[PDB]
């Protein structure tokens with residue numbers, strides 16, 4: 067009834083005490099269950115908390131006083147919305163959110179649910195109707211809301227408690243929800259990184275024997291790998307540099323200290339799921355990320371990852387990479403030198419008549435075995451690393467060009483045995499790509515690799531904008547010139563071709579006297595010359611110059627990711643040739659479990675020195691019984 | 697170096713002039729300018745009537761104004777226009 071909720075909104079204490087006398091004469095059972103608002107499930111308690119003020123409504127205790135005399139309180143407090151757009155939002159969700167920490171005490175006391183799952187549509191991921199996703203558990207609402215005194219209350223509250231494992235419809239626990247809510251801002255990063263500690267302290271204080279970060283969701287992604295994948299760099303920086311300094315919350319410390327003599331101290335980062343976990347390692351989830359994951363290129367500046375990939379590189383991958391380079395250098399030499407000495411006389415296939423022709427077909431065999439190689443290796447990139455239609459033609463500009471090289475290189479095999487001379491058109495595009503694809507292997511070299519990152523950005527930022535506009539003018543004046551010519555340069559090729567020469571400094575301003583109006587012709591070329599040679603090629607240099615200023619460190623961070631993707635494909639390739647990925651870290655004891663056992667975490671050393679932390683608060687230091695692992 | 701953001705702001709104005717000539721051109725082809733905003737109640741007049749101002753939504757999020765001083769908030773009886 068509208069009159070009932072009217073008195074709830076305007077905190078009318080006497081009217082709700084008058085209706086107290088009304089309903090208690092009746093049975094109340096269906097009576098109030100029919101009075102709640104149609105197709106929304108808005109009972110008197112839910113609506114009382116939306117229309118409260120400054121931490122009170124004066125009806126919220128009263129309606130619970132009515133519900134303890136008149137039975138069926140449990141249906142009232144746990145009454146959630148009915149529509150699929152506010153579904154499951156109990157009175158307790160509104161309690162946490164609107165900051166009245168004293169209110170939510172009464173609800174859990176009065177049989178309110180704390181395992182309430184609010185998956186409507188305002189609590190899912192849709193930019194239409196931009197809902198706020200908090201994790202689908204009130205424990206996670208308080209966590210995402212800067213309510214830490216409340217989350218502490220949710221786990222020491224009376225008889226009914228909140229289950230810290232906050233598995234929901236999507237499977238995201240509270241830590242997952244805290245990754246999904248981040249924004250990589252300073253206020254939010256400063257917040258969420260803190261909250262993990264207290265959730266983790268409490269998870270280790272109130273429910274030991276369950277380390278909370280190994281837990282996953284419906285899609286199967288830890289909060290570590292959910293921060294790696296969703297682009298959360300400050301979150302990821304915390305979880306990797308996590309250094310808890312207190313007993314019985316110390317096994318969860320991620321950055322240990324294996325010793326500290328003076329200023330020098332050997333940090334002992336753990337490689338738990340940075341590399342070689344059964345799914346979704348941080349390096350994979352960053353390296354094998356899609357395209358629009360924010361901060362993707364900065365997420366390897368995070369320690370230990372910058373110094374772990376440089377460890378795998380200097381130790382494992384630098385020797386296999388420079389071998390793969392050499393084998394591709396010689397593949398080009400063998401393929402070049404097999405194409406330079408092709409048979410000009412006749413139609414293919416050709417014969418091994420001379421002695422040299424046996425060596426030539428050999429280089430042709432060895433050429434095709436590498437074409438099917440980069441073919442299959444470009445297939446299984448689309449079966450191992452499944453892309454989407456946007457990430458085919460973006461973020462994977464290499465696996466296409468080595469695969470594209472093979473298309474020409476296998477069409478070359480089709481058109482050789484299909485009895486045509488068109489094998490040359492394909493064999494020659496395989497060479498230009500093939501040598502142009504040597505610029506892949508700059509990514510094992512810092513100064514050449516960054517240079518080749520500064521090549522790709524120009525081709526996509528500056529040539530791409532340039533050459534498009536350039537072809538507007540070119541075809542714009544070309545048509546304008548061949549329109550004027552009468553007659554031989556009366557073609558659109560031989561006039562686009564001659565006007566492209568002004569670009570490369572080979573423009574004759576008198577390439578045709580077969581015009582009919584000279585001033586038209588000369589006005590029309592000098593317009594092309596000024597707008598293209600003097601303006602637009604020099605404008606290009608300017609934009610490159612502004613680009614290079616922008617992409618200076620943004621290209622070094624694309625470089626370390628190019629090298630990173632190389633370090634991981636190298637692991638997957640040599641999984642049985644020599645060994646596994648080598649595990650890139652020493653299994654070392656860091657302390658003791660809370661269950662009273664050794665830990666033995668695969669850890670990566672980082673010798674660090676600091677000339678200001680003179681005190682050297684001992685804290686963690688593990689082999690302080692030793693001094694430097696001797 | 698000078699005209700980096702001073703050219704993006706000339707660009708949004710080039711696009712702006714295009715958005716408005718497009719309105720004036722198609723004033724009868726399909727519709728008016730489409731009015732680009734939902735007629736919504738924002739409160740009440742000082743003369744004691746509804747307001748119904750043509751308003752444009754902007755979903756905004758701020759991770760420092762934790763208190764959330766209520767002040768204006770209009771459909772606080774609701775939660776998110778449902």
Ligand SMILES: CCCCCCCCCCCCCCCCCC(=O)OC[C@H](COP(=O)(O)O[C@@H]1[C@H](O)[C@H](O)[C@@H](O)[C@H](O)[C@H]1O)OC(=O)CCCCCCCCCCCCCCCCC
Nearest residue numbers: 461462463464466495498499502503505506522525624628
């Ligand atoms: C009938 C056929 C018709 C054609 C259309 C069919 C499709 C065309 C092919 C698709 C592709 C079209 C490409 C157009 C030119 C641009 C190339 C370019 O930006 O590449 C950079 C690439 C980088 O590596 P990666 O991708 O691994 O790194 C990426 C990348 O950095 C990303 O930003 C990061 O997230 C992260 O680092 C990582 O995700 O570097 C190399 O791949 C090595 C160097 C490669 C050479 C670079 C120079 C450009 C040469 C182009 C011309 C080829 C040679 C002449 C041929 C003549 C005609 C046959």
Ligand SMILES: CCCCCCCC/C=C/CCCCCCCC(=O)O[C@@H](COC(=O)CCCCCCCCCCCCCCC)COP(=O)([O-])OCC[N+](C)(C)C
Nearest residue numbers: 533534535536537538539540541542545556557558559562
């Ligand atoms: C990076 C990718 C490559 C780019 C290459 C760029 C290079 C430049 C553009 C290359 C592509 C387009 C070239 C024209 C198409 C072939 C027809 C032609 O040349 O002449 C046609 C004539 O008529 C004309 O020349 C005018 C008609 C143009 C219609 C096509 C639109 C092209 C759009 C894009 C244009 C740019 C707009 C801006 C684009 C953003 C007929 O063919 P013909 O044989 O020449 O005529 C002989 C006929 N006769 C014997 C009876 C007398």
Ligand SMILES: CCCCCCCC/C=C\CCCCCCCC(=O)O[C@@H](COC(=O)CCCCCCCCCCCCCCC)COP(=O)([O-])OCC[N+](C)(C)C
Nearest residue numbers: 399400403404407408409420421422423425426428429432
């Ligand atoms: C290159 C330096 C850089 C360093 C890298 C070194 C790279 C390797 C170096 C050299 C390898 C080749 C040596 C043998 C051929 C020499 C004799 C010969 O035929 O000479 C002829 C040229 O050569 C040809 O006509 C053969 C075609 C080229 C061979 C391509 C490599 C084959 C794969 C196997 C290679 C090993 C891989 C497998 C190993 C396990 C002389 O020319 P012509 O006779 O005047 O005219 C051509 C003939 N025709 C007219 C009849 C058409």
Ligand SMILES: CCCCCCCC/C=C\CCCCCCCC(=O)O[C@@H](COC(=O)CCCCCCCCCCCCCCC)COP(=O)([O-])OCC[N+](C)(C)C
Nearest residue numbers: 389390391393394396397432435436439443464465468506
């Ligand atoms: C054929 C019989 C053997 C005789 C050949 C004779 C040699 C003549 C050479 C080349 C001709 C050989 C065939 C061509 C193969 C195509 C090229 C290729 O595979 O490149 C791969 C090499 O990575 C490999 O794993 C190569 C496989 C081993 C080659 C063994 C022969 C090398 C001998 C000589 C060793 C000398 C050592 C000296 C040390 C001082 C490319 O690496 P990738 O990891 O795929 O990364 C790129 C692909 N991506 C961009 C898509 C990611």
Ligand SMILES: CCCCCCCC/C=C\CCCCCCCC(=O)O[C@@H](COC(=O)CCCCCCCCCCCCCCC)COP(=O)([O-])OCC[N+](C)(C)C
Nearest residue numbers: 470472473474475476477480481484486488489491492495
């Ligand atoms: C991608 C997913 C996997 C692909 C499939 C997996 C395998 C891929 C690898 C290999 C399989 C082969 C693929 C290509 C086709 C072979 C050539 C051919 O059919 O030629 C035909 C003609 O051809 C010509 O007339 C021109 C030939 C030269 C073209 C040069 C560019 C090569 C492009 C390379 C492709 C780059 C494509 C770029 C992709 C974005 C021959 O057929 P025909 O009926 O006898 O025609 C005769 C006509 N004629 C007498 C007038 C001459």
Ligand SMILES: CCCCCCCC/C=C\CCCCCCCC(=O)O[C@@H](COC(=O)CCCCCCCCCCCCCCC)COP(=O)([O-])OCC[N+](C)(C)C
Nearest residue numbers: 379388391392395396504505506507508510511512513514
């Ligand atoms: C090892 C390769 C054997 C290849 C043998 C074949 C011949 C030689 C081939 C190429 C020359 C390679 C020499 C490498 C050693 C130089 C010193 C150095 O380490 O780097 C230095 C110079 O860096 C360079 O010289 C890199 C140049 C290669 C770029 C590849 C693109 C085109 C290749 C086309 C090739 C045509 C092939 C056709 C003819 C055969 C720079 O130092 P850095 O490394 O940047 O510093 C640390 C980097 N880090 C942070 C990653 C740790």
Ligand SMILES: CCCCCCCC/C=C\CCCCCCCC(=O)O[C@@H](COC(=O)CCCCCCCCCCCCCCC)COP(=O)([O-])OCC[N+](C)(C)C
Nearest residue numbers: 459460461523525526527528529530531532533534535537
């Ligand atoms: C005959 C007709 C053709 C004539 C010749 C054609 C010549 C070919 C050339 C240009 C064609 C015109 C497109 C100009 C694009 C401007 C540059 C750009 O967007 O670069 C981006 C592409 O980033 C990617 O990831 C996509 C890579 C492919 C190239 C983009 C253009 C092709 C797709 C579109 C459709 C093409 C339509 C083609 C015609 C149907 C990357 O650079 P950026 O975004 O500047 O980076 C700054 C970062 N910021 C944005 C955050 C500030």
Ligand SMILES: CCCCCCCC/C=C\CCCCCCCC(=O)O[C@@H](COC(=O)CCCCCCCCCCCCCCC)COP(=O)([O-])OCC[N+](C)(C)C
Nearest residue numbers: 581582583584585586587588589590591592593594596597
């Ligand atoms: C940038 C904004 C875009 C503007 C677009 C529009 C611009 C278009 C501009 C002008 C349009 C008209 C020019 C062509 C005339 C038509 C042909 C004609 O009758 O020619 C006559 C000749 O005449 C001459 O020889 C003298 C030409 C005088 C104009 C020279 C400067 C114009 C460019 C100023 C640029 C400033 C731009 C603004 C910046 C300050 C007679 O015919 P004929 O057969 O040629 O006679 C023999 C000729 N012969 C002796 C040479 C052999």
Ligand SMILES: CCCCCCCC/C=C\CCCCCCCC(=O)O[C@@H](COC(=O)CCCCCCCCCCCCCCC)COP(=O)([O-])OCC[N+](C)(C)C
Nearest residue numbers: 583584585586587588589590591592593594595596597601
């Ligand atoms: C933002 C948009 C881009 C700009 C678009 C607009 C740009 C428009 C561009 C150019 C416009 C100006 C040139 C017009 C073309 C010549 C037509 C003509 O009359 O030819 C006659 C010139 O007769 C003379 O007396 C010429 C004297 C001045 C020098 C000629 C120009 C130099 C070209 C370089 C200028 C570089 C500087 C460029 C600055 C413009 C030829 O007569 P003739 O039959 O051969 O008789 C021979 C003997 N006689 C010459 C003694 C008579």
Ligand code: NA
Nearest residue numbers: 569570571572
């Ligand atoms: Na020149």
Ligand code: NA
Nearest residue numbers: 570571572573
């Ligand atoms: Na020149």
